PDB file of C-alpha atoms in Angstrom:
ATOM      1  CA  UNK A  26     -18.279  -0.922 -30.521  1.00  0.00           C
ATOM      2  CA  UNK A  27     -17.839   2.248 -28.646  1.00  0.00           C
ATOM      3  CA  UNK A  28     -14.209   2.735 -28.836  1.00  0.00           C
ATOM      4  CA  UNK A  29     -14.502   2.514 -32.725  1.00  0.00           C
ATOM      5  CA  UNK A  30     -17.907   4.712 -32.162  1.00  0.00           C
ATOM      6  CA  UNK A  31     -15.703   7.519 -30.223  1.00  0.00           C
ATOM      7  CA  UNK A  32     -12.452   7.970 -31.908  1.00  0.00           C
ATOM      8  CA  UNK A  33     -14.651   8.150 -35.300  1.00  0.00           C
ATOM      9  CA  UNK A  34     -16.325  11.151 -33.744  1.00  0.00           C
ATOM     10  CA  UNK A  35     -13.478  12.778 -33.517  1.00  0.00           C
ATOM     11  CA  UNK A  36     -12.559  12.061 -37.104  1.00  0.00           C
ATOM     12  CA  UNK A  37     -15.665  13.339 -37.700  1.00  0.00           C
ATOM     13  CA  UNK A  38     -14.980  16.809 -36.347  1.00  0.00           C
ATOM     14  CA  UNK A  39     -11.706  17.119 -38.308  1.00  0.00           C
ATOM     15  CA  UNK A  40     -14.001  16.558 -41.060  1.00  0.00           C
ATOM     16  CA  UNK A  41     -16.450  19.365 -40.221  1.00  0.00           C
ATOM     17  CA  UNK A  42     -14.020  21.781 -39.527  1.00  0.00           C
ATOM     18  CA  UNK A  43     -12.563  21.138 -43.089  1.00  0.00           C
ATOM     19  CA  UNK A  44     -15.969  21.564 -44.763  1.00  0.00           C
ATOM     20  CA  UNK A  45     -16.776  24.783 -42.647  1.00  0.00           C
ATOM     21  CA  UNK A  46     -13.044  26.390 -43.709  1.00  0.00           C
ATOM     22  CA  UNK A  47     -14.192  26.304 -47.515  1.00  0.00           C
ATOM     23  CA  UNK A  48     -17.825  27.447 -46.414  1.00  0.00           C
ATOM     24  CA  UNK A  49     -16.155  30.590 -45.334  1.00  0.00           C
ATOM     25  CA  UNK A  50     -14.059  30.362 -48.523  1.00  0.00           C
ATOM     26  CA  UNK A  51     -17.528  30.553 -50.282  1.00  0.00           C
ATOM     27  CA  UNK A  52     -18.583  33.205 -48.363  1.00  0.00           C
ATOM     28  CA  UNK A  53     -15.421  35.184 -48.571  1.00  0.00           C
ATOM     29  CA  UNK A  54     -15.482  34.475 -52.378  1.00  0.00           C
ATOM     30  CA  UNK A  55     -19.090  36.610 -52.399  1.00  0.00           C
ATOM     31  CA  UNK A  56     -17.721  39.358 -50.576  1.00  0.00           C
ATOM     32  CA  UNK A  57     -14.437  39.384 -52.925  1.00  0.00           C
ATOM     33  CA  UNK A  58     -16.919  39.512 -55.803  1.00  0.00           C
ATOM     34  CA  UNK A  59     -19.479  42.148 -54.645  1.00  0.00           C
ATOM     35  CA  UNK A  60     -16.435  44.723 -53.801  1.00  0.00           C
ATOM     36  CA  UNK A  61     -15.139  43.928 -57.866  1.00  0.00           C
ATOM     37  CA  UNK A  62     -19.404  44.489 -58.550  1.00  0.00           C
ATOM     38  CA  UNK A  63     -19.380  47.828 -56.259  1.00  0.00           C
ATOM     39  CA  UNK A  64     -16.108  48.880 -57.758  1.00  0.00           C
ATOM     40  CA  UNK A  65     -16.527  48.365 -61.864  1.00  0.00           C
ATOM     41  CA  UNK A  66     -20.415  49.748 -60.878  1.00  0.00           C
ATOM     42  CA  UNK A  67     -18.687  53.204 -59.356  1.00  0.00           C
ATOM     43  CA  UNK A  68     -16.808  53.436 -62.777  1.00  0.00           C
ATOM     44  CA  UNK A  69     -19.601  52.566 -65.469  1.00  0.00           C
ATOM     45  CA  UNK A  70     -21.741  55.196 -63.435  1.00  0.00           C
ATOM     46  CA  UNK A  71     -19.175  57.915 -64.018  1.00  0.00           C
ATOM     47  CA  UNK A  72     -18.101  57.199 -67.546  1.00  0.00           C
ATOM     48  CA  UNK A  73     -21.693  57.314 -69.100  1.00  0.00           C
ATOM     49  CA  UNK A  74     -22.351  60.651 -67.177  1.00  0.00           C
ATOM     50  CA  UNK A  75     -19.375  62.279 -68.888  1.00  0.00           C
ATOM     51  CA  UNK A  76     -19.761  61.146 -72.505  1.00  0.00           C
ATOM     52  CA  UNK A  77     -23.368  62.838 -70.974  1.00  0.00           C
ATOM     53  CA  UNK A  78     -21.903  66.001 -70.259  1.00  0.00           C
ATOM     54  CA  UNK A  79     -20.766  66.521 -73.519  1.00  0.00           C
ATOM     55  CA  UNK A  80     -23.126  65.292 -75.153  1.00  0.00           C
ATOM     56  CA  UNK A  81     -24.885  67.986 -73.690  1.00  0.00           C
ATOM     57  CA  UNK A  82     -23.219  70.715 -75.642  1.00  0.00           C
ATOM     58  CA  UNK A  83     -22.760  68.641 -78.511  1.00  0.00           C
ATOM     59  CA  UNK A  84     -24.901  67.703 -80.992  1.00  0.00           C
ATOM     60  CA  UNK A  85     -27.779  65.299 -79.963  1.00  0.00           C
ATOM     61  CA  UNK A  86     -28.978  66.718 -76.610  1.00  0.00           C
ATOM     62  CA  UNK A  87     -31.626  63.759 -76.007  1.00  0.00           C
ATOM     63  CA  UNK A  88     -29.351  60.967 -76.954  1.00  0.00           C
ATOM     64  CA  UNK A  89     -27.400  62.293 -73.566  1.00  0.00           C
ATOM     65  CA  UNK A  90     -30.778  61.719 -71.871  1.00  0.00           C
ATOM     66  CA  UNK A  91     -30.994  58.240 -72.785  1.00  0.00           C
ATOM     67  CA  UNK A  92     -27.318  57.886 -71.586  1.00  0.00           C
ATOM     68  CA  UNK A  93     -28.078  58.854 -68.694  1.00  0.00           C
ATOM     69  CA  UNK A  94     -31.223  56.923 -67.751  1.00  0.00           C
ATOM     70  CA  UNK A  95     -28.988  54.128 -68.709  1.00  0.00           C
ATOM     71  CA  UNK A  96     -26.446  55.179 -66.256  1.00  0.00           C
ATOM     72  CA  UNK A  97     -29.354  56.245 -63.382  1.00  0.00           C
ATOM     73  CA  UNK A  98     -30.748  52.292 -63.789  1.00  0.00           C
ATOM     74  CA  UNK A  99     -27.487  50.775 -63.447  1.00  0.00           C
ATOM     75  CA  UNK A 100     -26.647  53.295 -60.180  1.00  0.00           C
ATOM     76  CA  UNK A 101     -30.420  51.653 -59.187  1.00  0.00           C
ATOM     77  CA  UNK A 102     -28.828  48.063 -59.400  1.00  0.00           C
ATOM     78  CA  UNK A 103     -25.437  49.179 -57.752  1.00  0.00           C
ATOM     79  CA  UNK A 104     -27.536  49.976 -54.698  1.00  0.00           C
ATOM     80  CA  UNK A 105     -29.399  46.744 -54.825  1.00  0.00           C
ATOM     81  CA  UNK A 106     -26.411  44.796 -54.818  1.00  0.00           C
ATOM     82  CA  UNK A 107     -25.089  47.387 -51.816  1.00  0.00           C
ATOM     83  CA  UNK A 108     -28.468  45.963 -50.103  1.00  0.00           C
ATOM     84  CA  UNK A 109     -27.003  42.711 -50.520  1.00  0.00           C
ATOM     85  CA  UNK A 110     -23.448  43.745 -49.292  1.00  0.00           C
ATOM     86  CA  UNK A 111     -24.749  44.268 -46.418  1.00  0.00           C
ATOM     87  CA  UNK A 112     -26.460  40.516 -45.996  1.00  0.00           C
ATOM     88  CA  UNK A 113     -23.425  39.149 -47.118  1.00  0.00           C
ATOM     89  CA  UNK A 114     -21.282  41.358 -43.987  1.00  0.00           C
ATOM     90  CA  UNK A 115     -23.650  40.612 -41.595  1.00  0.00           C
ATOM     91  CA  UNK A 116     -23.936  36.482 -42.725  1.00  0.00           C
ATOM     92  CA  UNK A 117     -20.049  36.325 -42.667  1.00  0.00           C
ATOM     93  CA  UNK A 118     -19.363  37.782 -39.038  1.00  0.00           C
ATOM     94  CA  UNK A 119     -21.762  35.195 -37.712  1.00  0.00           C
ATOM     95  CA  UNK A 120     -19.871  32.455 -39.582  1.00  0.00           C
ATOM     96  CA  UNK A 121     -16.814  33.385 -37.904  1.00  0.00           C
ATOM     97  CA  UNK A 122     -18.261  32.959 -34.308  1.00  0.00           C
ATOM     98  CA  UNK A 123     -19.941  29.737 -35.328  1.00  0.00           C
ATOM     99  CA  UNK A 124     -16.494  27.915 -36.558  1.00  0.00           C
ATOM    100  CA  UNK A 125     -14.697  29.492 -33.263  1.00  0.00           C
ATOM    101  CA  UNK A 126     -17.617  27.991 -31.298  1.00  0.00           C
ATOM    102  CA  UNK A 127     -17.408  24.602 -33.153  1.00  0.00           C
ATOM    103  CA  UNK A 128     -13.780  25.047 -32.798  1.00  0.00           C
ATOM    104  CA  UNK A 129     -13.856  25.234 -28.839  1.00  0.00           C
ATOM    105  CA  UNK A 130     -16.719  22.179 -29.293  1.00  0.00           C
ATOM    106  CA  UNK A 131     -14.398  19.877 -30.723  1.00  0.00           C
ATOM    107  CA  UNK A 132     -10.944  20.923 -28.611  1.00  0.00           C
ATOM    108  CA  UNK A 133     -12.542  20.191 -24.995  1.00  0.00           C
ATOM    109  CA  UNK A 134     -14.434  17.019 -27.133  1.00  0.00           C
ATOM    110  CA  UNK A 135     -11.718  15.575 -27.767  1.00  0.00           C
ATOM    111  CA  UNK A 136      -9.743  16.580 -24.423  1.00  0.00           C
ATOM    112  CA  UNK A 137     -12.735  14.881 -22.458  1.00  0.00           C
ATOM    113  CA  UNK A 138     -12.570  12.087 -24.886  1.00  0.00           C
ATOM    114  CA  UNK A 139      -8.779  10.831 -24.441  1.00  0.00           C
ATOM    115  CA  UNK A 140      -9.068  11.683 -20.841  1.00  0.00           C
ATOM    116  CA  UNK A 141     -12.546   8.972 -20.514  1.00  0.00           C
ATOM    117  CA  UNK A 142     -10.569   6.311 -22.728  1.00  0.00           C
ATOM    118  CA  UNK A 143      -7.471   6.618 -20.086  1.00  0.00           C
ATOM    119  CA  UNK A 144      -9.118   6.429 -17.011  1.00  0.00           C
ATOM    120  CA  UNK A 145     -11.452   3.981 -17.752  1.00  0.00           C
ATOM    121  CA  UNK A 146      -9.000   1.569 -19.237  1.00  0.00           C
ATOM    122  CA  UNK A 147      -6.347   2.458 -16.198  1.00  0.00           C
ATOM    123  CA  UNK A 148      -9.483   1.677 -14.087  1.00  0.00           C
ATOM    124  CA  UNK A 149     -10.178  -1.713 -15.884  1.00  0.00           C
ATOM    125  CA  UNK A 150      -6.711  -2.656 -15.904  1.00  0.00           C
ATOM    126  CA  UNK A 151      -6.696  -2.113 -11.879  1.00  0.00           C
ATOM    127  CA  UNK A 152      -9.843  -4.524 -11.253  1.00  0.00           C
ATOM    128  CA  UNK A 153      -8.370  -7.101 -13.656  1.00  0.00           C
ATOM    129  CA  UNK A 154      -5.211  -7.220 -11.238  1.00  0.00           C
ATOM    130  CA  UNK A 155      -7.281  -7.267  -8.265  1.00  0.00           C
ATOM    131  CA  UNK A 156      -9.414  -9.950  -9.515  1.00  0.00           C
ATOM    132  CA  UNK A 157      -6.470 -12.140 -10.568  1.00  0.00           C
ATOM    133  CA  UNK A 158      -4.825 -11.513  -7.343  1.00  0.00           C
ATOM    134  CA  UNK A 159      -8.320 -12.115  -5.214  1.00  0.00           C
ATOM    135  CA  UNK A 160      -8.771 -15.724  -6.734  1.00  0.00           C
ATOM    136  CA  UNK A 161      -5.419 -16.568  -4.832  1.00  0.00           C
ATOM    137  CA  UNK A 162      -5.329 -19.630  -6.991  1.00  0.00           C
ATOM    138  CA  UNK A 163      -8.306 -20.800  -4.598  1.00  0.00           C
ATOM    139  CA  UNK A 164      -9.718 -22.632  -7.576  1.00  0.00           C
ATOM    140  CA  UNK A 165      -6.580 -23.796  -9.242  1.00  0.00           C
ATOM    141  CA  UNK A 166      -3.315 -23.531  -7.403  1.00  0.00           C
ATOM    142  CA  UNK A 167      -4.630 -24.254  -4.081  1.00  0.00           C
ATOM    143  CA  UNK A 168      -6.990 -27.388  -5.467  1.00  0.00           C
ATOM    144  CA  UNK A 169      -4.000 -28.927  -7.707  1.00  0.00           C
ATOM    145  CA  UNK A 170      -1.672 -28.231  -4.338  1.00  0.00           C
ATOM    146  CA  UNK A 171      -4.222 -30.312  -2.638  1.00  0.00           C
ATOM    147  CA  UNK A 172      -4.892 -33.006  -5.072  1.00  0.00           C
ATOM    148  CA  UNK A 173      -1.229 -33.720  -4.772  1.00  0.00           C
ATOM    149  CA  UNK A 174      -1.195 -33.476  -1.029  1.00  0.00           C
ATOM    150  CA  UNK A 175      -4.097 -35.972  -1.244  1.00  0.00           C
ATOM    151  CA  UNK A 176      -2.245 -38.559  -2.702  1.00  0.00           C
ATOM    152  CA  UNK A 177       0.956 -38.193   0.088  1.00  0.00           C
ATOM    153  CA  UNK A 178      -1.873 -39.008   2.516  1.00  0.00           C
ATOM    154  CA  UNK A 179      -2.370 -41.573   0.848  1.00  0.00           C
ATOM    155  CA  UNK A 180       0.976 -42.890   0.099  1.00  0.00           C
ATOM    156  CA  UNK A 181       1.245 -41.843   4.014  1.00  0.00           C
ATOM    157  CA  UNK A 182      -1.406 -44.267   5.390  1.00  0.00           C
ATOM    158  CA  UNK A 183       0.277 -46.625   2.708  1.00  0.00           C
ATOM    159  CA  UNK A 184       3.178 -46.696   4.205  1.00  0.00           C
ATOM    160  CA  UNK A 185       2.182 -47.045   7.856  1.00  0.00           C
ATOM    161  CA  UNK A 186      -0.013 -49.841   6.748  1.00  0.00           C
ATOM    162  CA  UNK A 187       3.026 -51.699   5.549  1.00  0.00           C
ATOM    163  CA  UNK A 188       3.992 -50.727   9.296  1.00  0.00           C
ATOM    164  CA  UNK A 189       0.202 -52.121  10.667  1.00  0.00           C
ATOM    165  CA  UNK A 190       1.201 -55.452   9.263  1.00  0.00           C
ATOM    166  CA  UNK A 191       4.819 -55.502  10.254  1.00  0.00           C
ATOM    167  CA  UNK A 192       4.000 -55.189  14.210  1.00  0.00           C
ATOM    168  CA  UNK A 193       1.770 -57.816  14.477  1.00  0.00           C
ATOM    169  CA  UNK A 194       3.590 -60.871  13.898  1.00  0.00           C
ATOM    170  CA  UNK A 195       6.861 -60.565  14.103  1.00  0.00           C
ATOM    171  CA  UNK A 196       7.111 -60.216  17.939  1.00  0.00           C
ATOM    172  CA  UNK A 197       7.360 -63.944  18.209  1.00  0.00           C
ATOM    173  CA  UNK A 198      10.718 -63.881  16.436  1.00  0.00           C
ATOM    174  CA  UNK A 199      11.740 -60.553  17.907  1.00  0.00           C
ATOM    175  CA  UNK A 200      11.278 -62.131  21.712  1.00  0.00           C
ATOM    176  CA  UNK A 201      13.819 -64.687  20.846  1.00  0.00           C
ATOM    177  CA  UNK A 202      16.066 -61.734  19.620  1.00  0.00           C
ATOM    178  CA  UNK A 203      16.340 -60.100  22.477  1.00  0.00           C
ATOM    179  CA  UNK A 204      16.746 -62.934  24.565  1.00  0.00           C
ATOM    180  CA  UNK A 205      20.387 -63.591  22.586  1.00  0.00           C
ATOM    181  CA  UNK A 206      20.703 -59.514  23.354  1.00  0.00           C
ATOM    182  CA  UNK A 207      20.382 -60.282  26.939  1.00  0.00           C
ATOM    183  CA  UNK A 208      23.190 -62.783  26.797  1.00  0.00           C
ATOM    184  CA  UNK A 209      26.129 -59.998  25.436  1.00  0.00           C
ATOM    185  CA  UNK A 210      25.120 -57.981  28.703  1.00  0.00           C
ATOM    186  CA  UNK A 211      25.950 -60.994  30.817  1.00  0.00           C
ATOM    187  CA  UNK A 212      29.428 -60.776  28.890  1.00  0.00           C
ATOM    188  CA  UNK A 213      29.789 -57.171  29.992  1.00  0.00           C
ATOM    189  CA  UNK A 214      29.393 -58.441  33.738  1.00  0.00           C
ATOM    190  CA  UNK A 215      31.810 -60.802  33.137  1.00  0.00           C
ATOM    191  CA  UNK A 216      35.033 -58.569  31.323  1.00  0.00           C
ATOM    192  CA  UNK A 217      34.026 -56.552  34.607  1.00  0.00           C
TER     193      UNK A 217
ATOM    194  CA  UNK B   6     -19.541   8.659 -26.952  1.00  0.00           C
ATOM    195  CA  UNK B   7     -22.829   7.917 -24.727  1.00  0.00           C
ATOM    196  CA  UNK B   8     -22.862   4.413 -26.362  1.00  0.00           C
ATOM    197  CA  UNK B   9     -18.989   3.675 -25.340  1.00  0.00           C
ATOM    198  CA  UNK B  10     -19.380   5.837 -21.928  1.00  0.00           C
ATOM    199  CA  UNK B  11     -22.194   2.830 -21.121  1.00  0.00           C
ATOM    200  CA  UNK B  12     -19.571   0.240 -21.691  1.00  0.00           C
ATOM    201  CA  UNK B  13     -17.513   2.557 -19.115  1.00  0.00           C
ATOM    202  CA  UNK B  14     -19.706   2.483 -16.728  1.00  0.00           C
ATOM    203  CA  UNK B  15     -20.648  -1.025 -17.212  1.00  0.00           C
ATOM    204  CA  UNK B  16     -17.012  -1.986 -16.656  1.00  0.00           C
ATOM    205  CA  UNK B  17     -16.476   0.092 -13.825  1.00  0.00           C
ATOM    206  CA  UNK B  18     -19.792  -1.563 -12.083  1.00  0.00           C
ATOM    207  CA  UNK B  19     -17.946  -4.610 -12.971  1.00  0.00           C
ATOM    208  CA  UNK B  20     -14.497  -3.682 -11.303  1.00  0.00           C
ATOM    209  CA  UNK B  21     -16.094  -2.579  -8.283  1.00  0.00           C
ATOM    210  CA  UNK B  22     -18.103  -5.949  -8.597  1.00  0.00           C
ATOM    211  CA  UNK B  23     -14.934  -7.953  -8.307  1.00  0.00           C
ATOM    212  CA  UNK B  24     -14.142  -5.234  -5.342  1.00  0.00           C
ATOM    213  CA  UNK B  25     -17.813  -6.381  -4.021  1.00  0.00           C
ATOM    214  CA  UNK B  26     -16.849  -9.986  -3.396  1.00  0.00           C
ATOM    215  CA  UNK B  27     -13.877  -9.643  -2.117  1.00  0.00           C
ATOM    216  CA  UNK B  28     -14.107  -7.181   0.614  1.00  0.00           C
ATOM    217  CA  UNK B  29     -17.119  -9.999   2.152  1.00  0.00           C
ATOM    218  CA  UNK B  30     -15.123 -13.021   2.807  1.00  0.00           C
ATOM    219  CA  UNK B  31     -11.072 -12.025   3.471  1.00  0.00           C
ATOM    220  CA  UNK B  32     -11.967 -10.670   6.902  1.00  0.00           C
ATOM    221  CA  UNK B  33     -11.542 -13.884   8.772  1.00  0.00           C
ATOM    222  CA  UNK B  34      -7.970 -14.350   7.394  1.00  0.00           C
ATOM    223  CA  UNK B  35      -6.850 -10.646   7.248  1.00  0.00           C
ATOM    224  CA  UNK B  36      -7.419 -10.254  11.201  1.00  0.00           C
ATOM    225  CA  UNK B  37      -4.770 -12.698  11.998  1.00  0.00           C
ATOM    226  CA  UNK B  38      -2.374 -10.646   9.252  1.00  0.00           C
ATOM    227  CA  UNK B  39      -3.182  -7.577  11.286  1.00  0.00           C
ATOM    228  CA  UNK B  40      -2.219  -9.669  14.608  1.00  0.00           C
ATOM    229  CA  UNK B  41       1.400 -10.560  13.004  1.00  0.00           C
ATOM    230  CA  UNK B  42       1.367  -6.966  12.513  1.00  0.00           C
ATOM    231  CA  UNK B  43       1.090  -5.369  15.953  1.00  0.00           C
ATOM    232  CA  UNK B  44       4.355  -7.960  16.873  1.00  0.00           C
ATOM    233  CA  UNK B  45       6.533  -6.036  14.789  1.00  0.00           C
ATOM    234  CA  UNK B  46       5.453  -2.859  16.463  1.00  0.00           C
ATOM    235  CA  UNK B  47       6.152  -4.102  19.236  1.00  0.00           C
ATOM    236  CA  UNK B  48       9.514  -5.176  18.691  1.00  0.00           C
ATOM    237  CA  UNK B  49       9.838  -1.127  17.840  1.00  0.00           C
ATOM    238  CA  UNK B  50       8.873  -0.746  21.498  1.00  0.00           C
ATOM    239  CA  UNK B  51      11.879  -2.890  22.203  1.00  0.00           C
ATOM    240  CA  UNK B  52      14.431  -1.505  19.945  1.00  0.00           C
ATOM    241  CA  UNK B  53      13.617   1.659  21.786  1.00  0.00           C
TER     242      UNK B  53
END
């Protein structure tokens, strides 16, 4: 689902950013390395030359020679691995910019991200109260309010129907009721 | 995040659906709220 599909591209960054800090650990660790190279290189280069130099005066002139062509190839591969120095530089600056621009990459990514989760689900949230509030029981409340209402008509008309029966008969009685009712007035007259 | 941003927009579609049924039938009744209305503005009128 998407909201699992989001939030683990964000883990994913945290990841990447992790595996790029000991990338430029590796890189680091070659230009670490290739100063110790440069700097034991500088040394071995000297030393040989002076055993040279007195070698020169002493004894074995040609054995210095050899010394020294020893010394001259080994100065040759100190500035081949000075060619690669350089690579290494150059490789390392780059690597820098590219985790700062991943680093921006994933800060507004997950900014945007938290921002699109909380406005959508505010937004869904909204319509779920307007739709709950819009069916104004109209298909419930209302229809059980007028199944019940139903049923007083009908107890209603019931109950005027015992009154439909009641009327019509009873008037023969009723006639002779009154008549007796008539009679107490006449008593009135009289106590006047 | 395209994948989830489709459900967005598919729920916000839906939202404004609910939104697109109920603006077309309310009129009817919501005039004669809007009538009750105007009385109490006019009992303003008579306060002042």
């Amino acid at each position: 689902d998407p909201e699992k599909v989001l939030e683990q591209a964000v883990i994913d960054m945290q990841e990447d950013l992790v595996q790029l800090r000991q990338a430029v650990a590796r890189t680091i660790a070659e230009e670490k390395r290739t100063e110790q190279r440069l700097n034991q290189d500088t040394q071995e280069a000297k030393k040989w030359e002076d055993r040279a130099k007195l070698a020169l005066t002493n004894g074995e002139e040609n054995l210095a020679r050899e010394a020294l062509a020893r010394k001259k190839s080994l100065t040759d591969t100190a500035a081949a691995y000075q060619t690669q120095l350089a690579q290494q530089r150059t490789m390392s600056e780059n690597l820098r910019r590219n985790l700062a621009a991943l680093e921006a990459k994933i800060s507004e990514a997950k900014t945007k991200k938290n921002m699109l989760q909380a406005r959508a689900k505010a937004a869904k949230a909204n319509a779920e109260l307007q739709q709950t509030l819009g069916g104004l029981g109209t298909s419930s409340a209302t229809s059980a309010f007028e199944r019940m209402e139903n049923k007083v008509l009908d107890m209603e008309a019931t109950s005027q129907a015992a009154g439909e029966l009641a009327g019509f008969g009873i008037e023969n009685q009723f006639a002779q009721l009154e008549a007796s009712s008539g009679v107490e007035d006449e008593l009135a007259a009289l106590k006047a």
